[PDB]
Amino acid sequence: MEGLAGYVYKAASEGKVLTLAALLLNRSESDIRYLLGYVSQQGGQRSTPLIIAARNGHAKVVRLLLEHYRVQTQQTGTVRFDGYVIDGATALWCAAGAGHFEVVKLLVSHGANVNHTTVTNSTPLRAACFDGRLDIVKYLVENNANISIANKYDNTCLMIAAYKGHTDVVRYLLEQRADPNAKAHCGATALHFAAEAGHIDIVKELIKWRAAIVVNGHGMTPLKVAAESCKADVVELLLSHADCDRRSRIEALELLGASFANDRENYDIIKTYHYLYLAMLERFQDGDNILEKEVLPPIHAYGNRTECRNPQELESIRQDRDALHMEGLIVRERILGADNIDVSHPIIYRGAVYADNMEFEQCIKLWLHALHLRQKGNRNTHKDLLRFAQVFSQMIHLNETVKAPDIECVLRCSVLEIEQSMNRVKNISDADVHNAMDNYECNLYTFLYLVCISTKTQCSEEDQCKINKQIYNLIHLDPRTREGFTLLHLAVNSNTPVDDFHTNDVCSFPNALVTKLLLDCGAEVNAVDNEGNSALHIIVQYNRPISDFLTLHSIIISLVEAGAHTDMTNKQNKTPLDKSTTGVSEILLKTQMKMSLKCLAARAVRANDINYQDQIPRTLEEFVGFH
């Protein structure tokens, strides 16, 4: 039966030993196997009673289940971790991931498969080393556990222990014939993961254990990320390794100072200057064997400097915080190239700290340059675009003039990203389709915020005209929300969300100016969503019809000035007057109609179910479909 399986699973999860021996007593041979192994979908996870007793750490319940009822150890299930979803794992994997020694011992003594793998080739040894319990990993290794075999993603226990703060498990792994040269998809070896974590003792012991400094598939070295994550204790030991290169030495403690110059976690000036000066002295002592820098031409947004070639400009920027930070950013971009996504974050942080004390222009140009750099890399810039609309809303609220080309370029980037999101969700899988659509909706909302910003600006004729063509292109690629809400429907809706930043002080919906701008750029005014509503059906439902009356009024006439049909019936056959829910909107729409014998004839055709196919003009077919 299915009813008792739920109670058995509940008792196993709670681990009440006084309930297991009562619920599982006097059970037939078939039922004792049917109940133990039943799929219970709780909290979004498929939890076998055995695996849910192993995960909760009920050693007594697990021992009673294994010793008496003799449940198989090959049963699979799904356990929801902190951001980790694993299906197909056994009870040994669940016990190792939860870190309970007694359940692991009982399962292994009862015959649990230590070499059993999940869908992504994941062993319980990785689960045991995830929380770094030395007893469990020692017991598993002593029970024929293989460390050379990694998961589906070429990720064994070694780097899992490298990220985690536990050192006993990684030392035990390195003391049992472990190969630290295993490479991930992008050529990432164990030293890359150890340096990214930047644990001093792990990277110190890895030097003695054949660190094997090699270049991964990005043309990127473990020392680069060791010095990139703002840690000034790993680079010295990486140099202490006997195979350090001079060029790698040149990049080290120089990119480290660059990262220290611009980072929220490690923002300081004296440290940055000290490492920059020592890295400069590392090459500025030979003379006859000098290593002159190869510096790219300066960027107009990157000030007007070409890094430091002499010690005089190095010591001249000792008291200049902005100059030293900007040199650090420049050299970080030079060494890391223009492809790394992480180079935008220091620029964003510098712009944010420049904007937090009421100065905007340098922040504006830094965020614009970061937007350009991420546009080259083809990344999901939705959050950055959101914050960028936020900073425009703030600076408009503080009444400072707005650069029209900035709006121009951000709108063209927005429409390009919207098209990218369209093709992506067209070719997306069903697993991440919901978050892809959420990102698309955020892009739509930030596009509307930017359009409202543009309406709030006194752009010249050319700027506003090219904004009109770009918006024209956006509607001509037909962006539709998952509920059918086109751009006009979101522009005329008060239910369109606005984030908690300065946008709500400037960009509010419904907006008369945004609606008029959308109607200017060839928007489909009579667009119909899944519920059958149109822009008129949405604007008539406005809940503030007096205080914002003018805006509401304007929007209605704009729709009437753009061919919105006032007799259109939605999927429930409700004209916008039937959806008014307001006297003000009702009478505004009544005064904005015409008698329109076409509407009466179309209503007569629809109500009488006359087959209007090919016997009326082509436009009259959709006209009748309106009613």
């Binding site: 009478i587 009544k590 015409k594 008698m595 329109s596 014998l597 076409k598 009466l600 004839a601 179309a602 007569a604 055709v605 009488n608 006359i610 209007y612 016997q615 009326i616 003009p617 436009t619 009259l620 006209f623 009748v624």
Partner: protein, 96 residues
């Protein structure tokens, strides 16, 4: 100022000027080189609209100009099943 609407069957449908200027294309026909400001005939010829449809169109003209400002539950315009789908093309060709 009393225009004459002639259907496809020769049925004259003489109606008032402001009644017949509700339709856009009748206004267009009476405009341009169709004025003849002599208040003599103001004749417009409908080679396509049948008489049983032009009659309903003229009744619509009168009904609209009477009930254009009421907004107090105006009576429904009686459109027969057979007149519809032929009154629709007339209301399209004669805009509004």
């Amino acid at each position: 100022m009393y225009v004459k609407l002639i259907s496809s069957d020769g049925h004259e449908f003489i109606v008032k000027r402001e009644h017949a200027l509700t339709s856009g294309t009748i206004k267009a026909m009476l405009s341009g080189p169709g004025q003849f400001a002599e208040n003599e005939t103001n004749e417009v010829n409908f080679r396509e609209i049948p008489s049983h449809v032009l009659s309903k169109v003229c009744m619509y003209f009168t009904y609209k100009v009477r009930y254009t400002n009421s907004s107090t539950e105006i009576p429904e315009f009686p459109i027969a099943p057979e007149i519809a789908l032929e009154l629709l093309m007339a209301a399209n060709f004669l805009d509004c």
